[PDB]
Amino acid sequence: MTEYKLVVVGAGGVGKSALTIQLIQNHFVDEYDPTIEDSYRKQVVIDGETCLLDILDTAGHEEYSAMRDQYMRTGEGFLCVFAINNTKSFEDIHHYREQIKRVKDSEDVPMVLVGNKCDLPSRTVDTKQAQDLARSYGIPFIETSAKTRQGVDDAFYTLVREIRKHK
Ligand SMILES: COc1cccc(-c2cccc3c2O[C@H](CNC(=O)c2ccc(OCCN(C)C)cc2)CO3)n1
Ligand SMILES: Nc1nc2c(ncn2[C@@H]2O[C@H](COP(=O)(O)OP(=O)(O)NP(=O)(O)O)[C@@H](O)[C@H]2O)c(=O)[nH]1
Numbered sequence: 001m002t003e004y005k006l007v008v009v010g011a012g013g014v015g016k017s018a019l020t021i022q023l024i025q026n027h028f029v030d031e032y033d034p035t036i037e038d039s040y041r042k043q044v045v046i047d048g049e050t051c052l053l054d055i056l057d058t059a060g061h062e063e064y065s066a067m068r069d070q071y072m073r074t075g076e077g078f079l080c081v082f083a084i085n086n087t088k089s090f091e092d093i094h095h096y097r098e099q100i101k102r103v104k105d106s107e108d109v110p111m112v113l114v115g116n117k118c119d120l121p122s123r124t125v126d127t128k129q130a131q132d133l134a135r136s137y138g139i140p141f142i143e144t145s146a147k148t149r150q151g152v153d154d155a156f157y158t159l160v161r162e163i164r165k166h167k
């Protein structure tokens with residue numbers, strides 16, 4: 001079956017691990033254990049093609065490393081995640097897109113913008129703002145909650161569909 005290498009990126013605390021663990025294990029993690037680098041694997045069927053998702057879950061709180069750039073170079077597509085209750089994480093998205101475009105050395109990298117924590121009442125980033133940012137990058141936007149499971153499959157499966165279009 002076909003293999004897709006997906007990297008989940010974004011600011012500390014936005015829910016990159018919670019999203020991934022919700023996808024793999026059908027489990028919400030309540031505790032906040034910061035990530036350095038963790039990898040996961042899942043077989044799924046998307047649009048009738050059976051495929052193997054290799055998912056790399058990154059750190060938020062991370063300076064420069066040559067190691068960070070190796071795994072971003074091998075990654076075929078990226079979930080750029082922010083939290084809808086944290087405007088700074090949304091502003092940081094543009095930094096992640098630049099970091100990616102630099103290491104891949106391309107304008108046209110498969111990406112999906114993910115607004116996580118949509119279950120929380122303390123919304124500070126508007127759906128319309130995030131849609132406009134996504135439209136400006138020519139990429140999809142998906143609102144998710146690792147807690148309710150809303151959008152989780154959609155986020156990963158949409159990224160795979162983006163990788164297919166690109167090749
Ligand atoms: C066995 O394959 C798996 C399993 C789970 C996740 C991933 C995965 C997902 C997203 C991005 C990834 C991934 O692993 C890739 C392979 N793993 C690596 O650890 C890796 C090995 C060598 C690298 O250098 C690249 C070229 N040259 C120096 C050898 C770089 C990385 C790294 O990027 N791959
Ligand atoms: N209410 C709510 N909480 C969430 C959601 N997603 C993650 N969280 C919470 O946010 C905290 C951070 O989750 P985590 O997955 O650790 O975020 P992260 O981006 O992996 N952090 P890091 O980059 O430091 O590894 C956790 O306590 C978790 O319960 C969500 O959709 N809703």
Ligand SMILES: [Mg+2]
Nearest residue numbers: 016017034035
């Ligand atoms: Mg994490």
